[PDB]
Amino acid sequence: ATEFTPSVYSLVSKPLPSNSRPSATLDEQAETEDLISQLFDLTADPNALVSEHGKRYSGLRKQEHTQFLASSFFQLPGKFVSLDASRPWLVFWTVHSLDLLGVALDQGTKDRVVSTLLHFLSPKGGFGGGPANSQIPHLLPTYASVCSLAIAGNDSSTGGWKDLAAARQSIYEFFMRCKRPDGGFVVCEGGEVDVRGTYCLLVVATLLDIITPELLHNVDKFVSACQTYEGGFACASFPFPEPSCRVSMAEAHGGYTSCSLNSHFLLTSVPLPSFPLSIDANAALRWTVLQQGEPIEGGGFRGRTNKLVDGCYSWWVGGGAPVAEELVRREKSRKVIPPIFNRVALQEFTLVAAQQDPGSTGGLRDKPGKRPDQYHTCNNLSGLSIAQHKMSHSPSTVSSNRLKFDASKGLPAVKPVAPGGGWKNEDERQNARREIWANALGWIEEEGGEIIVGGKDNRINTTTPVFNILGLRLKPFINYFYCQE
Amino acid sequence: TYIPMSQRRSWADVKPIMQDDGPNPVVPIMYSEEYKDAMDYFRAIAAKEEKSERALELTEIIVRMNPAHYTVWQYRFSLLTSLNKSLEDELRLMNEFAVQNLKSYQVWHHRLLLLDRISPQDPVSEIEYIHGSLLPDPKNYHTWAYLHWLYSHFSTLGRISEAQWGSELDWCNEMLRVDGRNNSAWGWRWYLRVSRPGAETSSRSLQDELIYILKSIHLIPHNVSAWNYLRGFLKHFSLPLVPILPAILPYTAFPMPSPLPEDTPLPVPLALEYLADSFIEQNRVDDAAKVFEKLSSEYDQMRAGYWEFRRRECA
Ligand SMILES: Cn1cncc1[C@@](N)(c1ccc(Cl)cc1)c1ccc2c(c1)c(-c1cccc(Cl)c1)cc(=O)n2C
Ligand SMILES: CC(C)=CCC/C(C)=C/CC/C(C)=C/CONC(=O)CP(=O)(O)O
Ligand SMILES: O=S(=O)(O)C[C@H](O)CNC1CCCCC1
Ligand SMILES: O=S(=O)(O)C[C@H](O)CNC1CCCCC1
Ligand SMILES: O=S(=O)(O)C[C@H](O)CNC1CCCCC1
Ligand SMILES: [Zn+2]
Questions:
Q1: CB B214 within 8 A of CB B254
Q2: From ligand 2's centre to the CA of B146, what distance in Å?
Q3: Ligand 2, atom 2: nearest CA belongs to which residue?
Q4: Does the B1-315 domain belong in CATH 1.25.40.120?
């Protein structure tokens, strides 16, 4: 299992060399190396049987993390006003982390989650960062609310899924209002264009059966032009005057690379001709693995070249690895196995460096020296899950899915904005529904692929790449909207 | 003490609207009296779609308390355009925001909208503003993306002169001199020299660029930014790796390496990567496999699995 995933404790820790050229980047790096390596030195090797006397025990402190998320759950201090336009994210970070940690909400609490989120839904379409009487709809809280409804909701009259189903046409119309001719989307009325919006929209459109040709036109081209010379993806591409050329607008970054890989992956399910425009999968895989930090910085991921490692990149970068790997696999097959990143070291970074010091607030954090928060709790745990569980997109699972799909069952077709904006006919629409549903349910945990650093009490549940909700949430949720139950 | 808005003569005609969370909401935030009051009145203002000076003042009050409130920013920009307000004054206000540490993405996006609508014949002063804001915060991701947008937008309008492009490269060169490990400035160099539509591509252009890249590597051999740029450059222009190999070979053991600078332990893993890829270019797959094996087992063990994957690709 671990021949090609050495423990940080088994490797020589050495600083990034200076080449006798000091700089601000190197000063910060050296300082961070010192901080992380010193915490590792104070902590017992999680892999040891002779769990060392005098040293900190690295076991995942699930109960502390649960208490951290609870206290944020039902009343937040005044300082949280900075996240008043991100309340659905607060919900998602909480409920998804609780799922990963194996902690159940009672039905009464789940009902409060559903009711809260329904008050964020506008009749005209989409969820905003707070109540519909206070905030306009936005692609990001639309993803966060939809996913949280998958986690906390159900098919009953008070379960929220029914309301989402009734909202399909309006959500679709919101997505079309966000659409730009070059294939990008604004995140909200008057808002920024970026690939996070594309990602959030494509996840929701996939889950709710509201994908159309007009919704997707140029969307692949926008995403593909986000890829930088480094192999990762920037937040956006700029269309020069449909466009004569498209150019990436910033650095390859973990967050935008995750969004671009996932968006591109979602598009590969869609049966349009010559669609989606290809990305350079080999380069994206290379960029991904290159972001894993050295032993001295604990084997955590950084978000961009020559910046610092940070626990949230365990999800953004580590969670993009199975996607990049699958795209590389497909490319190789179209011309014509060891782990692709250090799954052990990433777990060690999480357990040793990313957890709040014991006997305090709980929660997980960017790095030592930083306060934990809900966002870093969710993303550290999501990345931990990807490292513990070998995730594959399985062609034979997708084939089984196609075989069991019932195209005669479904919710009403979306009415396109433009007369010819829908699928050509029912054969094509149903084929599209089948492919999109079958591929969404194609991710599997490989048998015998589990690596739980530190022993089985550290095991968390399996998140799904691309979506980032548990497979046990994803399946009944997408089955509800496709009437496949 | 605070004066509630229900007691202000200027707001007497307005009936505030309460936040509608429903009963017993999750993730409720404890709000200051001031923020709750401002939002109760904003709800009323926005519901009736009032475009007025008092509404404009109210949006400033709110975004000063919560700079990330995208809804209130959207309403603010609607107000600026409806009232035909001075957009230059608004930019000055955004300048004042930065001085008062009121930064957020929404502030920068608001600047972008203002620049787009003002549509100045020459955007030099905003370029200089961006430069000044990067000096103390040199890797700010969204500031760099804004700089890319500004140049891209104004260049499609034909408003960036050759002198302007020239001074921009000079500024970029200085940023990389100050910190050669600044990947954001390397990304900007790529736009300036390679990706932008107006970039020159000639034999001398490629030559000059290669010289700059190799010199950068020789100055800081372990600098991942410079290696990735080298690899991106050769790939983009379909240039073979082999003819440059003499400049790289010393790191595996046109500008050539220095005695190497102190604190330069060998081998440099990305120099080995370059060597392996050059063997592959030559169809020498066994020799490439041998290098990948060494990267995997000895020289870059964090990526043992990846280098093993590359090794297996060869055999
Ligand atoms: C770049 N980064 C790396 N780690 C954290 C950050 C970030 N600068 C950030 C900003 C925007 C987005 Cl879309 C994602 C991440 C950051 C840092 C700290 C943060 C939050 C975000 C966020 C946050 C807030 C809203 C959305 C998202 Cl995705 C994240 C919440 C929070 O409580 N804290 C402490
Ligand atoms: C809603 C979603 C999916 C958002 C994407 C998540 C991320 C990581 C977005 C990127 C946000 C970003 C680039 C913030 C800028 O802050 N970055 C830094 O301060 C430097 P670093 O890249 O090293 O964190
Ligand atoms: O989140 S965890 O770290 O697993 C849980 C905390 O350590 C709780 N420890 C208790 C202290 C008193 C004796 C019973 C155990
Ligand atoms: O019919 S819908 O438009 O979906 C429902 C309401 O009108 C939403 N309008 C809010 C008013 C206050 C500011 C945020 C928007
Ligand atoms: O299942 S196994 O991996 O063999 C071993 C257990 O999970 C070990 N977990 C510890 C039990 C004692 C308290 C600290 C955690
Ligand atoms: Zn982070």
A1: yes
A2: 15
A3: A196
A4: yes
